[PDB]
Amino acid sequence: DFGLDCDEHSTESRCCRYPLTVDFEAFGWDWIIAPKRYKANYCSGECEFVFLQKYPHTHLVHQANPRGSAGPCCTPTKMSPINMLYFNGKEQIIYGKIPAMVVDRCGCS
Amino acid sequence: DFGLDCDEHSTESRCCRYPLTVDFEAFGWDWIIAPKRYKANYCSGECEFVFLQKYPHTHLVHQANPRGSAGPCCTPTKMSPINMLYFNGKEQIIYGKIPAMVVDRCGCS
Amino acid sequence: GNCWLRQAKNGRCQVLYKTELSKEECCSTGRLSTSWTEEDVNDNTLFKWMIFNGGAPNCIPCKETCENVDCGPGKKCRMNKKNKPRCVCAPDCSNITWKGPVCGLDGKTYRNECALLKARCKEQPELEVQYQGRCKKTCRDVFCPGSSTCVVDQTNNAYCVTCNRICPEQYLCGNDGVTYSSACHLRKATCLLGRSIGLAYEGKCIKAKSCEDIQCTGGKKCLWDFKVGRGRCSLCDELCPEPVCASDNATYASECAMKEAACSSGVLLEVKHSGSCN
Amino acid sequence: GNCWLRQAKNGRCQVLYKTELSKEECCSTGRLSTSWTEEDVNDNTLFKWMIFNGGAPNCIPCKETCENVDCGPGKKCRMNKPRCVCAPDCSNITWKGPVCGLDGKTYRNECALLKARCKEQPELEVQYQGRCKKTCRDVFCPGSSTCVVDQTNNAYCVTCNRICPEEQYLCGNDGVTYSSACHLRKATCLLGRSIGLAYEGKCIKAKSCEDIQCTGGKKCLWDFKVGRGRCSLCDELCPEPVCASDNATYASECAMKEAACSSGVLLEVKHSGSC
């Protein structure tokens, strides 16, 4: 409830999380055994005023408006791991939990 | 040792942390007793390839290039609080840690 | 007033969504947590409350009860302990014929398929049954569904997986002394074997009689396996931070220290068992 | 080869900074942790090692001893690998004893506070000499600063803004009318402790809550100890037990506040723990 989820049917301008399936075979990640595909999701949309901002720093910097400071951008504020079975660099079969593969939540930073 | 720090005299194109002082009086945040000023810093610079990316999710979304996805942006990957003394909404003197006021590290997300 | 994505546990509004909206506009969807505040205030006042006072006060939740809440697929609305509507996992378990435990992809045994579907919904969105029954050690009497096949990981856990049966038509030498024409081929054969074979070195296998016959590359060093009479190129670049008995029948303080000694001496060492050889 | 921001604890390279450059290029700044790998490889292979294998192997640290390292202002290089340690200039400090940091913590001396500032807390400075104190009794603030206490009675030396721009009347819990928030804050600051806002508008000589009309979704709470009311938000929820001023025990401080809000009776904590 900390973020917005959208889909293809949404008409949402704000920073929002959308669906996306990643298919490893199609990406060239041929060392992965399982899973073959997974829902990674992604973040998209606008960051105006302080909408969807969790950190006071963000708007403090925007008002200070210093040189080189771009506007805030829509970005993951929470990530989740996925469990994978894959071949390591020695071609051994390894089960491991791989951090930060999935976006759980999007916000403006 | 996880990020780059830069000053006005850097010729660093990549995502980097730069200094910035925030002055609460100048901002008109007049409920703040102390401190009057602090070092907030800010993030600026380019994010190409997989440079300065901590999360594998970032480049995976890039490869897929779904509608609405913007390239990775240079953003805080680590924030710090500051101790503050201020008047709360009841005008009581409160000491507290205010989270995410300072950027410690910048990265491409 | 202002529209917020949530009422915090302290009861105040957080996560600004929109400004200058009436309640009717802010609350016009089925989204569970959306909340509203009446007051329109200048920026600084807003910041004052959001940052230093725990959120905007007089936060009014759009949904006071389960009426009109749209939890989405496989979820239902139920009032919680603090009397607030909540979306809770309610998977349809109605068409499930298998009644016993199941082994999830995560390698964990679930009580039954209904419990796995709950964990999928609650925590692990990529969770699925990989095979029926409890999870197993070794592939003995593991019968994988359909045309998937059994392999074990580094801890002897059994998984049912689909082997990449078709490689695209970079030589490697496996620790089995077999030359493979690519990674894909070595991986395919590994999958069919059901356990790691392991990469010995890049290029074609040679009938080495010692490490002198093997020219490692990529900053690797040759380790000789005296048990099988074949060599192996290993990185030897890892640093070390439970004593083990190695295949040389010596005790080392750690599996990591054993690897350091293997690397130093050019002799392949494997853990025989835990604790001192003596 | 590839240039990396650091060598991890496992010895492998992490945090990709630049690709296709030579050791001398990568290693050409004063950055302590920068590291290099020789092999240029295709993208997927690179991702494979970074994500699934603990980083890029055969990581070669640029700086293996202290020579050529730029630790920056306040710090100096020292072998532990080489490491940048905090070494503030203390040779110029006159005061010798404990000091109270702006963070409210006592430091053994100013030099220790300096090192903590360099190491952990960039905003850290001395607010007054000696140990941090409870209450403002015998706290002698330096310069133009004055003492105030926070919600836990800790003393701070601060600079009480004394300039207010002369419609926004407020009634303080002291029964005094202030012409603005700025004035109430100034008086509070001068008093040395919270006075607090009773309600918007000028104070009225109220005899009960019926005499006070709260504004903006607030409820009147009557203080029977002093015979004055205040308007409180009463909007907070409760997600150690206390003994309240009604001499009753409550499961929590805001359970107490909830009871106060329902009854219209101001309640304060007498002490922590059951009555």
Side-chain angles (χ1 to χ4, degrees), chain B residues 1-5 12-15 17 25 29-40 49-53 55-57 59-60 63 80-85 87-97 102 104 106, chain D residues 5-7 14-19 31 33 43-44 46-47 50-51 83 102-104 117 121-123 148-151 154 156 158-161 170 173 181 184-185 188-189 192-198 218 230 232 236 257:
Chain B
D1 50 16
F2 302 77
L4 299 162
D5 285 347
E12 182 52 74
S13 68
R14 301 181 187 297
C15 179
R17 179 177 69 141
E25 299 172 304
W29 290 16
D30 51 43
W31 60 92
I32 293 155
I33 298 166
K36 313 293 194 190
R37 293 160 221 92
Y38 80 102
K39 292 192 254 53
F49 192 32
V50 299
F51 300 128
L52 286 317
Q53 293 187 9
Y55 311 148
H57 178 270
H59 194 65
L60 288 165
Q63 294 208 190
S80 271
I82 62 172
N83 300 127
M84 300 196 72
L85 196 73
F87 290 102
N88 68 359
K90 292 177 291 202
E91 299 298 347
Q92 293 167 337
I93 300 173
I94 303 294
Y95 176 82
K97 281 191 175 42
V102 176
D104 295 336
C106 298
Chain D
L5 285 210
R6 67 187 304 259
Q7 181 183 39
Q14 296 181 0
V15 171
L16 186 67
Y17 167 79
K18 267 164 139 167
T19 58
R31 195 159 179 288
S33 296
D43 292 354
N44 291 339
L46 194 66
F47 310 163
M50 300 184 267
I51 296 162
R83 269 307 180 180
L102 292 166
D103 62 358
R117 167 171 183 101
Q121 195 169 342
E123 302 306 325
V148 304
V149 303
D150 64 13
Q151 72 274 31
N154 300 305
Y156 301 80
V158 308
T159 299
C160 292
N161 170 38
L170 300 176
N173 281 324
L184 166 61
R185 291 171 188 160
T188 295
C189 212
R193 70 181 183 272
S194 298
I195 293 158
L197 170 68
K218 299 173 159 191
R230 72 183 60 185
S232 312
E236 283 168 317
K257 295 190 191 178

Side-chain angles (χ1 to χ4, degrees), chain C residues 5-38 40-80 83-122 124-164 166-214 216-237 239-259 261-276:
Chain C
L5 293 196
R6 69 185 300 258
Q7 189 186 45
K9 292 306 216 286
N10 68 4
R12 293 182 175 163
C13 270
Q14 301 179 354
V15 174
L16 188 66
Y17 174 63
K18 277 173 164 151
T19 56
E20 324 261 69
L21 277 187
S22 65
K23 202 196 167 194
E24 295 63 41
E25 295 164 328
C26 170
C27 304
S28 66
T29 77
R31 188 177 177 278
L32 168 66
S33 290
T34 305
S35 301
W36 189 69
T37 48
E38 182 162 349
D40 291 315
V41 288
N42 56 45
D43 293 357
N44 281 358
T45 306
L46 202 57
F47 293 113
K48 178 184 151 78
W49 286 94
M50 303 181 293
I51 303 171
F52 298 84
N53 295 269
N58 296 318
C59 184
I60 303 158
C62 293
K63 302 290 186 288
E64 293 293 1
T65 71
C66 277
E67 295 261 11
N68 298 100
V69 169
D70 172 350
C71 291
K75 294 245 209 166
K76 74 168 188 280
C77 185
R78 182 166 58 76
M79 303 291 313
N80 73 357
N83 198 40
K84 300 280 202 171
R86 278 291 175 283
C87 290
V88 306
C89 291
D92 159 46
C93 298
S94 77
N95 300 10
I96 290 175
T97 57
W98 174 249
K99 302 305 192 180
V102 300
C103 186
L105 300 163
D106 55 2
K108 296 213 148 167
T109 296
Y110 291 83
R111 180 169 180 259
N112 52 34
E113 185 168 343
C114 196
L116 177 142
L117 288 169
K118 296 178 50 63
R120 180 174 170 95
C121 177
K122 214 178 175 180
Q124 213 191 143
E126 303 309 316
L127 193 49
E128 285 191 314
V129 179
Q130 59 167 143
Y131 56 91
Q132 306 183 160
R134 305 203 164 259
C135 292
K136 297 298 181 206
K137 293 282 178 181
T138 77
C139 281
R140 181 68 176 266
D141 302 316
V142 176
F143 293 96
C144 289
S147 62
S148 65
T149 307
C150 194
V151 300
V152 294
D153 63 9
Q154 72 277 29
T155 323
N156 224 0
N157 301 313
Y159 299 78
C160 289
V161 301
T162 297
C163 305
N164 191 358
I166 296 312
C167 289
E169 276 164 312
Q170 35 183 353
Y171 302 100
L172 303 177
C173 184
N175 287 323
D176 52 358
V178 170
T179 289
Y180 295 96
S181 56
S182 64
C184 183
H185 282 282
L186 170 57
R187 287 166 192 159
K188 174 161 165 286
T190 295
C191 195
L192 304 190
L193 184 61
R195 67 183 183 270
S196 299
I197 294 179
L199 168 66
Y201 49 82
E202 292 86 349
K204 308 166 181 195
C205 293
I206 49 155
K207 289 160 176 158
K209 60 181 60 65
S210 75
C211 273
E212 274 146 56
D213 291 330
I214 296 158
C216 293
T217 75
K220 299 196 208 62
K221 181 171 171 180
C222 178
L223 303 177
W224 192 257
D225 186 341
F226 287 88
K227 295 177 66 54
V228 309
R230 291 194 295 276
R232 174 180 311 214
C233 296
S234 318
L235 282 168
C236 293
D237 72 321
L239 302 174
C240 302
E242 56 193 32
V244 313
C245 181
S247 51
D248 58 356
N249 306 303
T251 309
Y252 299 86
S254 153
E255 176 181 50
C256 196
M258 174 200 69
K259 286 174 169 187
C263 281
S264 280
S265 58
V267 176
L268 179 71
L269 297 183
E270 299 286 319
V271 176
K272 195 175 216 174
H273 62 78
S274 319
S276 179

